[PDB]
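User: Vacuolar-sorting receptor 1, Arabidopsis thaliana:
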Amino acid sequence: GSRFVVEKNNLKVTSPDSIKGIYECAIGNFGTLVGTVVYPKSNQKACKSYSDFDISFKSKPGRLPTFVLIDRGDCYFTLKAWIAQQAGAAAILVADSKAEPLITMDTPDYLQNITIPSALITKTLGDSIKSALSGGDMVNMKLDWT
Ligand SMILES: [Cl-]
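Assistant: Predicted structure for Vacuolar-sorting receptor 1:
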């Protein structure tokens, strides 16, 4: 089957209240955690090393782990997950570039070494998160890989 499996009650936005709720996502097969979402200002498709930009997603001690929001395009989803993992992300969310069913997004080497949770999300949810972040809101999220 597909390497990303659609799940109905596995992603919960916990803050801000404007977008709080439960949303569908497609969880990667390779691969509960609460994290804070960041949308990088560069290399937004995660097809090149974040270290070339001097960008790190490792959280400070005592702070929420960082979930990186990544745009679909230009490279395979597994490479995006590997690259965010090397940058210290605790998980990755890849937002679709088109408005369409999630199951359509996952179309037909280091894959055995990906260890962070990975999920695909819709364009609508990606845009909502980006809007919340752009306004100054912290976006917190709970992933459940059950
Ligand atoms: Cl695989």
